[PDB]
Structure formats: C-alpha cells, structure tokens
Design a protein around this ligand. Structure first.
Ligand SMILES: CC1=C(O)/C(=C\N=C(/Cc2c[nH]c3ncccc23)C(=O)O)C(COP(=O)(O)O)=CN1
Ligand SMILES: CC1=C(O)/C(=C\N=C(/Cc2c[nH]c3ncccc23)C(=O)O)C(COP(=O)(O)O)=CN1
Ligand SMILES: Cc1ncc(COP(=O)(O)O)c(/C=N/[C@@H](Cc2c[nH]c3ncccc23)C(=O)O)c1O
Ligand SMILES: Cc1ncc(COP(=O)(O)O)c(/C=N/[C@@H](Cc2c[nH]c3ncccc23)C(=O)O)c1O
Ligand SMILES: [K+]
Ligand SMILES: [K+]
Lengths: 465, 466, 465, 459
C-alpha cells in the first residue's frame, strides 16, 4: 500500500465525531436496518456516496460569490456553454439540477424521437451497465434496460485493465435480437459504476460508437465519472501515455452524440447536472422543451447561478492529473490495505470507491437475502462508517416478471468523496472492516418490511433473519 | 406616492450597468424580440421575475457555509421539517429543487391516487388561477386546468381588497358539472400571481376548503407568495388586525391538505422548493417514491445542503412584518407613480409586482398580437429595463382545440426581486414608462416564428408585425 | 434636492432596528452621555464614522476567499505593490492594519531621519489640517502639529470650490518662522477631514509640493479619502473636466513623496491601511524596520491575507466615477435637505459627511461646553441616529499649555458609510434633525467626569449642565 | 511513529505546487539566500510559522459573515468579553490586531505604572523565556528582558515533562539581584516558544505567581499557545488526568494578573490579538488610553468585526481536546519519524513545531557560518519546504550554542502525508549533508538581519 500526498492543503474544516456503540445500535434499529435512513448525526465517516459530498476549492467558492443569479441569460450559463465546447467539442448545453434531472430531460426525448415513423414499438436502451436512476428512467418510460458489461467484470480477483468495457459480442447479438429500430439509444457509462467504478477503454468506446453509427443508433455518454475514466485511459492505454487528461477527454467524446452528467461527481460539486448535445439541434430543441416544465428555464435548469459558476470552475479542476493521481491513488490505498489482509475486492480498484466482494466474504447468505447489506450493517455497528450496497438490493426487480433481477456481483461499496477524507481516515475504515475477520461467517441476511416498487434500496425497511 | 425606508442596510453589492441604445437594439434582434432570450449582460434593471433573484441576508449566507451536504440525513433536512411543522402545522416534508419540481412530485401522485380507486376518469384541477408551470403539469398528466378567479380581478382600475379570491358560485358549478370524482384537487394560489399578485381572503380560503371536504376533494396550497398573501390578510381583514404574520399563516394552512412551494419567492432564496403534507401519510409515501427518480433522495430533493439551510432561515425572514411592509410598500410606490401619471394598473397593487393593463394602455393592438409584449419591447429599447408579459402569450393555446386560450387580461408585469432594488431604482422604471406616453400609439403587435407546444413564451421568437 | 440612483444592486442585507426611546435614554446615560460608549445594539442608523463600515462588492468577497494567508511573500502583497505603482506611481509599499498604524510606522521614521542630518531641534509638522490620530502621533513623537487650512473653511454657509486648501501665505510664514530644518514633514490631507471633507485643489497641492521641494521638506499625503478628493478635482477644475478619475489621482501624487492611507475609507474596506513611498529607499528601509515590532512582517503589516486581497479590489472600485458620483451625490442630497430647512452646514458638502455648524445652530452653548455634542445627544434621543463631534471635544487640549485648543469650527458630523444606506435612510436622518427646530435654543452643554490625556473624545464620560 | 486521525473532514481546499529545483535556487538567490524573502509562490510546504496560517472551521467562516463591523460597540466585542470571562475568569478585555500589538498596548503601561512612585529606575522584565517581539518591546521601552528557563531545556535529546518551566532558583536570585521595585512584570510564556514549544507545569506557574504576589510583582501570561500548554498539563500532571481542557485553562490563569495573546495561534485565526486583565481597573484604563492612538478604538483594536467574531469561535474550538490530541500528535509524528531515523530533535516535541539541531548534521560548517540556514536552504532546494532558523541568525555574534531549524506546523492545514514528505526530505539529505558548504553575507542590514539579509554560499 502506497500513500500518495495531497496536491492541496486544507483551507476549511468540518467537525466529525464517533457516535457511541449504543447510539449506532439504536440508530440502525430506528432506520429499519437501512443506513440510507440514518441521520448524518449518527454517522462517523460517510462512505454512502461520492455524489455531492465533495470538498470544493477556494476558487469554486469565490466563483459562487460572484455568480449571476439572473433568471434568463445568466453570465455563468454562457461560461458553462463555452467550457462544454472546450472539453467535449459539443455545441449545445442544457443545465440540469443533477444527473437524474438530465436523464429526465434527455431519455423521454430520445424515446419520442425514435418513435417517429412508428419505430421503437418494443423499445430498449443498451448500456455496459445502467446505474439505478438511469435504469429507472428507462423503465419508467416503458423501455427495457439491457446491461452488457464484459464478463471479466465478474471475476473480482482476476486483474483486467478495462472491467467496464461493453461486451461487443453481446451488443451485436442485442442489435440482432431487438433490431436497430427498437434501440432508442446506447448509454456508455464512464466509469462503469455498477462494475466497480471500472474504466471503459478508448478502443471499446470507439468500437461501440462505430457499430451504433452503422445502424443509426444514438449514443449517450453517462458522464458522471468521466475524468476518472480519462485517467485510466492515460494510465493503461499505451496509445495515450503522453496525452494530457483533456486530450483523452476530447477523444472520449468523439464516440457519443450527447452526454448526461451528474456534476456532483467528477466536477467536484455539491449539486448540479448537465446535458450537452454534440450537433443534433432538433434533439436539443426538444430537450429544451422538456427542461422548462421539469427543471427550469433553459439557462439555469433548476440551478442557482452560483452553482453554474462552481460547475465551470469544477469542470477544470476535475481534469487535473495531479489531483486525479492522488484521488484514485487514495482509493487504491484503501483497496490495497483490505486486499493485503485477505478481504476480497474488485481488483483493480476503480476511480471512486473500493467494492468489497461479499459473495466471497459471506457465503452463507444467498444473494436475494442481500449479503453485502449484512456486512454493511455490521461494519456500521462496529465503527460508525456508513457504506452502501451495489448488489441484488440495488439491482431491484425486473419490470416484466416482477422477480429479483439476477445479480452477478454482490458488492459492498466504500465510496470516497473527493478531497474530503485523509489516508488516516482510510486506515480507520480498513482496520474496522479487518477487525470483522471472525464475524463474517456468523452474519445473516435481511428481509423486507416495506419495499418501494421503484428504486427500492433508498427507502426500504428491512428486518434481520 | 410614499417611500418606505428599508428595515435593513446593505452588506454586499453587485454592479449593474446601462447598455447603450446600440447594444439594446442589436441585442433585441439577436434575441428574436423576446426579452426572455436576452443575455443578462444586455439588461440594466431586471424585472423579468421575482423568482430566485432575491438578495439574502448575512444570516442566510452564514447558514449556507455550515450547511450539511450529506447525501442522506442532512441536519438541515430535519431543521426544514421542524420549520414546516412550526409555520404550517404540517407533519411531512419533501424538499424539491424548485416550485415546478414540487408540482412534478405531487400532482401526478394525486391523480394516480384518485385513479386507483376508480375515480378521475375525466380528471380536472380547479384553481383561483393556475400559474403556467402548474397548469403545464396538469395538462402533461392528461387533466384540464380550470381557473375560476373572481370577476373583480378583471376590473383593473377599481379597488378591491381581495382580487385573488375564488369565485365560489363558479366552484360549485364546476363541481356539479364535472363531478367530485373527476376533481383531482383544488389548488389555492396565494397570492394569486396571474390575477396580479392579488390576495385571497381568509374567509374565501376557508369557504373553498369547507366545500372541498364536503366533496372529498384534496386541496393544495400553491404557496410561493404565502407571506405576501398573509400580509394582506393582516392589513385588510379586520379579524386579523392584531394578529402576527405567523398566526395569519398558521390559520391560512388550516384550509389546505398539502402545499407546493417555490422557495425562490417569499422565502428569499436563489433556488429551492418544498412539498409539505398536513397528515396524509399515504400521499406522503407515494410522493417520496416519485421524488427519488425525479429529484433526488428524500432528505435533499435536488437541493444542496447549503440551500436547505438557507431555506430554513429564509422561511423565518420572509414572515417578518417590517420586511413585508417595506417590500409591498415598494411595489405600491412604483404603482402609485404610474397610476399618478394616468397609466392603468391592476389596483391595488399586489405583493411582488406592478401589473400594467395593456388592454387599456394600447387598445389598437389586438389580444392575439400580444399588446403587452409590444410595450415591454419598447420599454427595453428605451431604458434597458426588461419586463415580462402576463396575458395571451403566457396563457397559450388550448390543449384540446389547439387555439388561443381567451385572455381576459393583458398585463405587462414589472416584477420586483426582494431586497435588491431601491426606491430610486423604482423612480428610474417609472420615469421611463411614463416617457413612452406619446409612443403607445404607433406600437403594433407581434406574431410567432417558432412556437413551442408547452410554455411557449419562454423560447418563442417573435416577428414584428410593424 | 436631487436623488442619484445606486450604480449597483443589493446582493446581501443586514438587519437594523429602531430602539425605543426608553432604551435610548437608558443607553445614553450608561454611556456617560458619550455616544462613543453606546453598544451598537442601541443604535438604529450609525453615522459615527465612514471608517470600516463600508459594504464590499461580491468581487471583494471573492478576493477574500482566495486570499493568501502566507506569513511571508503573500501573493496579495505583490498584487498590492503592483496596484500602488499603477495608481500612484510609487515604488514601495508597507501594508498596515489601518491608518494610524501607517502613521505609527512612518512618522517616527521621518523625525529620526530629519534628526540624523542634525536638524529637527524643535520639530514641527505642517498640514492643511491634521486629523486627530495624525496629530496625536505628531505630538507623541515630540513635535508640534500646525494646521493652516484656508480661511474659506471657517465661512461655513458661503460656497467655495476648495475649502480644504492649504493657506499658501501661512505655509511660507511657518517655514520662515520655524525654519525648514525644523519642519519634519508637510502632510497634505485629501480630502481635508477636519474642514468638513472638503477638497484640496490640484493647483494647491502642486504649489505646496513645489514650495516644499524648494526647502528640502518631505511631503506626506494623508490619503484616506483621495478618491473623493479626485472626484471634486474633475468636477470643479476645468483642466481635468475630461480626465479620468485615475488620471487625476496619478497627477495628485506627483505632489507628494509618500502616503499614509486608511483603506477603511475610500478603498471600501472594513480594515486595512497602507504606507506607500515614491522612491526614497532609505525611508522605506527605516519604515520597514519599525513595521516589524509594531505591525507585523513587512509583507502583511498586521493584516490577514484576505484583507490585502480585498484592498487590491477595493482600490479599483473606489476610483470608479459612476460610484463616486452617486456616493458624493447622496451626501449632497442629505446636506441639501438640511440646508433647505435652514440648518447651517458646511456648504458645499464634502465627500463623506454632512457637517452641521453648531456654533450657529446652538449659539447659547460656549465652545468649551461642546455645543455639537449637545445636538448629537438630542438627535440620538429623538431618532436612534448616532453622529459624532468635530469641534472642541475632538480638538482636545494643547500639550504645551494644557488647556483647550482654540477651535475655529464646532461641527456635528453626519458621517455616511459607502454603499450602506439608501436615500430613504437619508430622508429619515434629515426629517429627524429638521424635526428638532423648536428644541435647539434649549440645549445645554456638558462637563468632564473622566478625561483621557490623549484622544479624550473616544472614551471620556460626560455629565450635562 | 503513530499517525492520529483528524477529528474533522475537509470542507475547502487550496492548491499547493512543488516548484522545480531551478526555481528554488533562482528564487533563493533573489531572496538573498534568506527564506523570509521568498515569495509564497516559490514555497511548496510552508513551515515558516504556525502564526496566521491556520485553517478555520465552517463555523468560524459563518461567524465572520454575520460579524458586526460597527466602529464603536460591535456585538462581537461583547461576545469576546464574555468569552474571556468564561475561559480565563478575567473581567477586562482590549482586542488588538495581533500579539505584538497586544504587547505594545500593555507593556509600556506596566512600566509607567511601576514608575508611579519613584521606582523602576533600572527596570527589567523576567520570563521563562521572552519571545522575540516580547523582548523587543521590553527593550524598546528601556528595560532588560531576563530569560530564566529551566536548565533541562538545554539537554535536547533527554526527555523531561516540563522543559518550559521557570528556574525557580534563578527567579528568586533575580528578584534579590534587581529588587522587586525594578521588576516591572514577570512574563509566563505558555507554551515556551523559544524553548521549543515546551510546556510549563501548573505547579511551576503556581509557585511563580506565589513568589510574585509576595513581592507585589505583576504577572502577565503570554498566551499565544495556551491550549497546547493546557493539553500537556492534562497529559503529564496526574492531578489533572480527569480534568477537562477548560478546567486546566481556568486553573492556569489563576496564576497571572493579565494576559497578552496572539490569537493567530491556538485560537486558530489568520489575524487577531487580545489583552485581558484579571481585575486591575487602573491598568485596564491606562491600557485603553494607549490602544486608541496605536491600534484603534477600544471595542475593535485594529480588527475587523468579522475577525473578532471568528476569535470568539476559535477560542472555543482551540480548547477541544480531540482536536488538541490530534494537533500535538501530528507534530509528535513528524518528530518521531525524524528521531527514529537518527535526526537530533528537541525531545519531547512541543505543541506546534519540531526543532532539528543542525550543528550535529553538518559538522563541516562552524558557528560563524550559519549551519542551520544551510540545512534550511538544502531542505528547500530538494523539497520546497520553507523552514525557519533559530540559531546564530536569530541575532538579538552573541552566543547561541543552539543551532536549530524549526519545522512549524500550522493548525489543521497539512496531513500526515505532508509530514512524511517533510521527514523524508530532511532524512533524504544524508547523502548531501557532508557536501554542504557555508554561507557568507553578500549583503547585511544593520538590524533584524534574518528578515532581509542577502547571503551567498562560501567556496
Ligand atoms: C404561483 C406559482 C409561481 O408563481 C411559480 C413561479 N413563478 C415565476 C417564475 C417563472 C415560472 N414561469 C414563469 N413565466 C413567466 C415569468 C416567470 C416565470 C414568476 O416569475 O412568476 C411557480 C413555479 O415555481 P419555480 O419557478 O419552478 O420555482 C409555481 N407557482
Ligand atoms: C484624515 C484621516 C482620517 O480621517 C483618519 C480616520 N478617521 C476616521 C476614524 C476615527 C479616527 N478618529 C476619529 N475621531 C472621530 C470620529 C471617527 C474617528 C473618521 O471617522 O474620520 C485617520 C486614521 O485612520 P484609522 O482610523 O487608523 O484607519 C487618519 N487620517
Ligand atoms: C453513473 C451514474 N449515472 C447517473 C447518476 C445519477 O446522478 P444524480 O441524479 O445522483 O446526480 C449517478 C449517481 N450516482 C451516485 C448517487 C446515487 C444514485 N443512486 C444510488 N444508489 C446507491 C448509492 C448511491 C447512489 C452514487 O453512485 O453515489 C451515477 O453514478
Ligand atoms: C510566545 C509569543 N508571543 C508573542 C508573539 C507575537 O504574536 P504576533 O504579533 O505574531 O501575533 C508570538 C508570535 N510568534 C510567531 C510569529 C513570529 C513572530 N516573530 C517571528 N520570528 C521568527 C519566526 C516566527 C515569528 C512564531 O513564533 O511563529 C509568540 O510566539
Ligand atoms: K450535497
Ligand atoms: K437564481
């Protein structure tokens, strides 16, 4: 394990505290054994998400202070437009309040666009892996969300450079089975969140885009963690060994027609999202027509002016290789601590989180009893650290059959907010999980009490078995 | 006209400037003669809206700096929950990113809830006046938005205390015509924005709510300007002469079952919204399940923690009567200057804006050519002040006939952000509009070039009829 | 009277409240009938000073957030150095924590420098008018503070363009009487605070400086209100009718060798000061050696880095002519409201405050009895407004005689902070003072219960008669 | 070496960068081989001082935003007064712009007060150790600054619990030698900055006060690092094992009549100072009379209202034991990395810095050549770390025998990963220790040379 030094120093701090063991026992109980329902006061180190919990820079705060709050035509809207043209070469932007607002703007518009000439009667979206909000917006619009990530993502312990890659073979099979007229769009998720924050390679992105253009399919880059994906392409693809991060990013976006971004991830924000469209002005115009009732006027999209200002500055800071080397180096430090102590993880670690393979850590719990959640619950009761489950619990149920979607991966996700926690905080997280060495086989799964029909993991209430 | 002094002093400023006439003329053509498409840099004083442009206090900024950005369980969510219980006596909250996010959470839930028990077969919503994003969500979900504001709202020059009131006769007639089963909800808009920011009386709120419960109809308080409405109740209803503003608000919300709020108006914020539900936990649970895919997790709802913290403090500051007296007195001062000069306005002025009656100011322009928009564009080329149209352009086409919804009133809305402009800014606005007294005749209407199907006035480009 | 619109809009507000007459009377007695000893909570509109009470711009706050707090070599120290070269053409700067800190750094250095040559056996300083802390530092260093303002300043109701001017005949008289070897420095105070914020003409500054060089005498510009002085030069001097404000300022500082500045005035700050020296490197070095024990290291001078950053920005905003036009016009609006009702004021109004002539308003109270302080107290009891005395109270006793210095003016100063109050606040002040027309003849002065030996008006406790 | 986790998380960051080795030698050249003349843009990790470079909390920045900027009677002045009464039990406050502003207010007043009845004809001040600005103000007013730290502070490698103590024997001897009428005040400096940030025990503070009160001598507590001292007392005095940090502090200030404070240290500020007086109203009145010409009006003292607001909150946060344990543990972690690798340091480490003895690292450079400055320059050229010299360059040649480079650590600014960068730089200098040459004056000022002198390597 190698500690990589921060390429910054601290300017402002926020207190944290360890709640007592009896606080955590009561809190988890009151929260229905779902840490999503805990108050933050009951949490020590929060590893629930890397979304919106990032520490901004003094430059981002100063940009907020001078942000233009004008309802129409904010100065910051035009800076954000130029920045998106600078980084992605995309000519149209619509701000959104966060990533699932961008998906609510774009995905219904793509469906209606595809349904011209009476096509897309049995419509589907195709992705390496639809994350939860993305798949929910696909299915809420009456489509199937099809995930075709490479099967090397399924062998946790075996190294591979690109575990977020599309399976090109399955992509061709799905185009053959469904037909190009049913494929509303392809979604390239960079990095692949559900596979473990694992990068998609540039040739993979290129190859998927070639096939899509052959068949007239629209391609959307789910871009929440694009800077982490660009760093991995520079690190693992020899063809980009001497490229700047921005140069890799520019090339990534030659292989999509539009993007949906949660700016709460790699742009280092606490709120914000973005739709950018390359050159298709009709899809842009239709999305603007949906933005107005759902999000806001097309020059702020449900954001305050200051948050567009912070996003402009965040989009620059998130591409800095010195910062990305440290950020992804910190994730790698935590993974190497756990791996050295015999804890199975998705290897190599991805950009934003260590994914602990609980299918190997707790074999006595079947996947539909949520094994990673039993581990998460025990880790919290022992340490005050709050983690999150990326497995059968999050995967949910098939819209058609109403049964559990089969999960090939049962991950506990230790999600690391950017520039928030030190490597000493990582050591606490590592030692806490390692201290559970003798209790893993003792753990038992969980059973529902209240299950939402959609995105159930957020508010479900569980009971032990 | 009477000038009322600020109950505050200035702690931070932001420069503004006056574009040259050369820039304004050019900027308007580049904007398609739709001021909504002007860059803010081309605007001197911005009267487009009172939404999200407000100046916050130092205490509001301090609340932001210590805001808790946690994804789940932010301390500011629990503060917001207690604050809603304090102000409205409502036990459930869901934050939203702004008012139309709150509408998108709640209104589809209310429809499906009634549909699930075999009702709402031909569904309608009824309001004193649905505002545009509110009506847009009604229509997007397959329902009809019915507006029944008192006819006194159309008698602009004649003073009345409660020009936002429901027409009670018309409420009962619609309930009989459509049936209670088909009425998804009644929406009480306070103040009534479309009628000129005009207040709804307490006794009108109470009668509407009592009729609603007799028929099992859910009532939603559209609450963006609830503090301005409450100030008017204290000012004009003798029963509330000696009540506090909070006591007036507490009584107002006895006459609804839920609220949707744009916290960008009276809570004095730059972003933010809220759903609050009095005590219907099933509606609450259904609203939360829609919040998650559309807005965000149920304890931040598409807001930053710092914005929930700012809302908690702003909800307090927006009820302060010395602030409300000053704010509404500034709007009144602007209207008095215009009304002194013969310009017809909705009288008395409402809480957030002066509404100029352009059907009385420029009779030569027909309603479907948007006479208020012609006056707005001339005021911009003359002064750099950007105003907004509240008439046919905003009312739009009927989603069933595809033709112009008949506009009983053509208003140019001079909308005043809270604590942003001084009374000397008000004098500049009034002097410029009075300065167009000789050119109101020679003003002609406008036609469409690109018309959106929903909420057309925003991105539409207009062609001068000449 | 003419109301001039703010060339800004409001971005942040701070509550104020009117204390009840009962609280006012209790607080005034507890403060020893000296409003300097009132807590701010007992004050509605504060007109005690225009020092450190200004409202900053969003850009000033954005500069604070990114300020460099380094102990040595702050980025903002160098930016401030560059700003002084641009504005004043001066080559050396020493930041100070405020104006009297600048005077403490520089005045002892100028005296020892004059003595090292063998001179200064009976040392004096000469100014159009030394303000209080300036004269206190002159006297604390063993020198006499001689004031020779134009006689026009004593003719309060009669208009004159340049009531802050040096009396040229008296300058030569004092140079002949004391000898050039005894004059440590000439202090050009711009605007002349004690004469009523009244401007010094460019031709007067030039003639003073040329007389000073003739005799080898160092010239210091007391520059707390140099931008207001510059606006008056453009407005009233035909030579500069079409010059920019910055061009006026650059010409002003051709007529001095160094400057001491409270940045809490015209650079729109809440704290801060500055020494700038034109080119005399020896004085700069000696002043640096005194900066270290009294203020701090020479690259921050007792300021946080954020306050240097705000000063750079404020130096620029303080010179914008649209702002000065409004600021001075608001002072002029309040003065005109008072003058139209028959209240005698120093006319024309100066840059920062309206000076009410209380020798004429309350002729029954002798000067030694402080008639202006009687009007101030009455105004406060009536309205919550706190004003300050610029007469015999502030002038204090003479170090040699020990008795009251002869006061040629007895003013109540209504001091206006920058960008803080609106013209409706000005109307409130005007109506309050105008409403006291009947009570003016009935007022009675005060006596000393506790008199500090130096700068007695800040902390003295008085008792009516 | 044990790493102690931060009891906080990061809310706002500020970029740092490593300048190239060519920039370092060119900038150190322009700086005249004096690190104080480097711009910050030339410095990677700044270890020059723990004064004014601290990271504030979100609560401190919120307090600034609502700060009352009124000239007279700021809301935050009264808050600060109450906070001094709570923490110290002292009844009178005067804000100052920083520590040496507070000394400029109080020390000339104490001298005039002692002279009131034909006394103090040969006046002196006595301290466990006067810091530089403290000693400079004493001498600028015509007094001698006598330093009488315990002898165990001079044995750098040998542990002792209280290396900042007064030598009680010397205190009684100096009282007898100078007479209690010439002792204007005793200055108890906590922690003892010049001894290495080393604490003063409660019993030492107690006995010193008892002696002074018997002789009618005024006792001033120099309080810049009072919380760090309070932590060491609770950690090393068994009587206080179970006391809170605030209870320790309350007890400390029973043994003084006044305090001067740089709030730029333990109160976690970027600017700010404080005078507080226990109950002597006459000294308070005279101190206010000097505040007005020198600092500002007596309710802000040369501070913005926002900075007084931040001070009130910082005084609370600087007492938090979880934070102090981490803060003093991080300095100790750097010290242990160095001590475990054969680098001589003042042992144990103090509250705010690590002192490295360079006279033993470069046994080729004599005292008349500034060995610690050559190590500092060598450390800056290989890491970008700017440390300060406390040896033959702190000219106030006289004597020295102590050639220490100080590694001063700002509060809540640098991680233990930054500490490792620093330690590995100073340990990685083994290969170039022997080949390091001395430094000569290329340009020397007559006074305060280490602030502005220019040097050049000796060939
Ligand atoms: C009563 C009520 C409102 O007034 C209301 C918003 N009003 C606005 C803002 C904006 C919305 N459409 C417009 N058309 C023309 C000019 C401006 C606007 C206003 O400027 O009037 C909302 C929606 O909340 P939000 O804006 O999503 O947060 C719900 N209900
Ligand atoms: C011309 C000039 C000044 O006006 C000046 C400061 N003036 C002030 C502030 C204050 C000082 N004494 C007062 N007596 C009565 C009322 C207020 C005051 C003002 O309100 O007029 C200074 C000193 O600067 P600082 O305060 O250290 O930053 C130097 N020169
Ligand atoms: C690839 C990709 N696309 C779109 C989005 C949606 O963006 P948004 O609306 O939140 O801005 C995300 C968001 N991910 C975040 C937040 C989150 C959403 N659901 C979750 N379930 C469990 C744990 C966390 C989460 C994260 O994984 O922590 C994303 O990762
Ligand atoms: C015990 C004690 N008393 C008073 C003071 C004065 O407070 P101030 O005016 O700075 O606020 C201090 C301050 N010391 C600081 C800063 C500093 C001043 N001179 C220096 N020379 C070399 C290196 C650093 C410094 C420190 O040691 O780094 C103090 O330590
Ligand atoms: K957040
Ligand atoms: K806004």
């Amino acid at each position: 394990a190698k500690r990589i030094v921060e390429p910054f120093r601290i300017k402002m701090v926020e207190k944290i505290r360890v709640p007592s063991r009896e606080e955590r026992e009561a809190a988890l109980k009151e929260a229905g054994y779902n840490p999503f329902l805990l108050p933050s006061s009951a949490v020590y180190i929060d590893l629930l998400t890397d979304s919106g919990t990032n520490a901004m820079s003094d430059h981002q705060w100063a940009a907020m202070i001078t942000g233009d709050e004008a309802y129409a035509g904010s100065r910051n809207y035009y800076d954000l437009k130029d920045k998106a043209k600078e980084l992605f070469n995309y000519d149209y932007i619509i701000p959104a309040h966060q990533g699932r607002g961008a998906e609510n703007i774009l995905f219904p518009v793509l469906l209606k666009y595809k349904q011209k000439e009476g096509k897309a009667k049995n419509p589907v979206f195709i992705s390496n892996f639809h994350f939860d909000t993305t798949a929910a917006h696909v299915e809420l619009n009456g489509c199937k969300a099809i995930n075709i990530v490479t099967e090397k993502a399924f062998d946790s312990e075996t190294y591979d450079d690109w575990k977020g890659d599309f399976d090109i073979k399955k992509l061709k099979e799905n185009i053959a089975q469904h037909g190009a007229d049913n494929i509303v769009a392809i979604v390239s998720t960079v990095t692949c969140n559900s596979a473990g924050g694992q990068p998609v390679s540039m040739s993979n992105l290129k190859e998927v885009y070639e096939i899509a253009k052959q068949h007239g399919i629209f391609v959307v880059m789910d871009s929440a963690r694009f800077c982490e994906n660009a760093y991995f392409i520079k690190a693992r693809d020899p063809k980009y060994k001497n490229a700047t991060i921005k140069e890799v990013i520019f090339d990534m976006y030659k292989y999509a027609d539009a993007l949906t971004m949660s700016a709460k991830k790699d742009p280092l924000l606490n709120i914000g999202g973005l739709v950018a469209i390359r050159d298709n002005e009709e899809i842009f115009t239709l999305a603007r027509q949906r933005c107005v009732p759902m999000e806001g006027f097309v020059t702020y999209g449900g954001l305050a002016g200051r948050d567009m200002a912070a996003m402009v500055q965040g989009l620059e800071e998130g591409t800095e290789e010195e910062y990305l080397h440290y950020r992804i180096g910190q994730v790698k430090y935590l993974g190497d601590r756990l791996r050295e102590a015999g804890i199975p993880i998705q290897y190599p670690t991805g950009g934003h989180a260590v994914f602990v393979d609980c299918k190997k850590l707790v074999p006595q719990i079947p996947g539909d009893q949520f094994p990673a959640q039993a581990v998460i619950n025990a880790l919290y009761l022992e340490s005050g650290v709050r983690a999150v489950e990326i497995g059968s619990f999050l995967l949910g149920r098939d819209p058609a059959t109403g049964e559990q979607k089969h999960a090939d991966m049962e991950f506990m996700r230790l999600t690391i907010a950017r520039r928030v926690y030190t490597n000493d905080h990582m050591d606490y997280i590592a030692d806490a999980l390692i201290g559970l060495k003798e209790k893993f086989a003792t753990l038992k799964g969980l059973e529902f009490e209240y299950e939402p029909p959609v995105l159930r993991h957020f508010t479900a209430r569980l009971k032990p078995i």
